[PDB]
Amino acid sequence: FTLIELMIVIAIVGILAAVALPAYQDYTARAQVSEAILLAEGQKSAVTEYYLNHGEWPGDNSSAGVATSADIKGKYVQSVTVANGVITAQMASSNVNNEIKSKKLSLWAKRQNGSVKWFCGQPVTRTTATATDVAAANGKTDDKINTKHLPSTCRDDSSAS
């Protein structure tokens, strides 16, 4: 070989040293969202019982017999709120991923003639404790977890039945 080959080798080494990386932030955000999913999954044992024994969905945390919203905290979750049978979990604000900072996800159920279906996805809201339909959050504050930061099994739409 000669000097040209060595220079080309050095250039190739420099090229390989600085290379683009895939979007690994989305996977980390997906991993961190699972904590809020698990924390919200633990409050459905006290909502279904109230609905079954009273005929209407719980209005607040007091009616469902769960702890205070600000007291349901984890490593990346700061609050879990129950409102008209809808469970909303909010992320933290300081030591989290830059993409799921102060964002919310929902967990609601719809009653069928022989089962009670459960849905997971973006935030939704109800209107009355005796209603059977849900609508979008429309918070106008950009507090919705993006689709890319959710599992493929947790992307239900507000009109799903």
Epitope: G59, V82, A83
Partner: nanobody, 127 residues
Framework: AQLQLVESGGGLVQPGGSLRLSCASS????????IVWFRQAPGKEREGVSC????????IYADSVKGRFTISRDNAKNTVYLQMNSLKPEDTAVYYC????????????????????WGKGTLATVS
């Protein structure tokens, strides 16, 4: 878990007058409660008048005070106001202020049952 409520603003006014009642609550999480106003006339029993939700976007009234009473909440001063207009001689009673615990600051449930704390009461007579 020792919230206390103080009621002030009562007085004596002629019929057709206006009065402003204020309830001040201090201690721990005072923004997690729903303030409900009661009224007890001599001879009769206690009854509900107005209620306000924790979120502040749900206010209910009584059939006998519809269109004449207004209730507002200001969390900055930790006070809840109840304004009366077009007073009637049949409104002579003692007003009380009490709170109900709701584990959320974004609730919309108002109820007149199962109250926790209470207040001393304020005197309001019209003649």
């Amino acid at each position: 878990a020792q919230l206390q409520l103080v009621e002030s603003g009562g007085g004596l006014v002629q019929p057709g007058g206006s009065l402003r009642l204020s309830c001040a609550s201090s201690g721990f999480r005072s923004d997690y409660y729903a303030i409900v106003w009661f009224r007890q006339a001599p001879g009769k029993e206690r009854e509900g008048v107005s209620c306000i939700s924790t979120s502040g976007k749900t206010t209910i009234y009584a059939d006998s005070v519809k269109g004449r009473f207004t209730i507002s909440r200001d969390n900055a001063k930790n006070t809840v106001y109840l304004q009366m207009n077009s007073l009637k001689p049949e409104d002579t009673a003692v007003y009380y202020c009490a709170a109900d615990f709701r584990g959320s600051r974004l609730s919309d449930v108002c109820s007149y049952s199962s109250m926790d704390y209470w207040g001393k009461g304020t005197l309001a007579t019209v003649s």
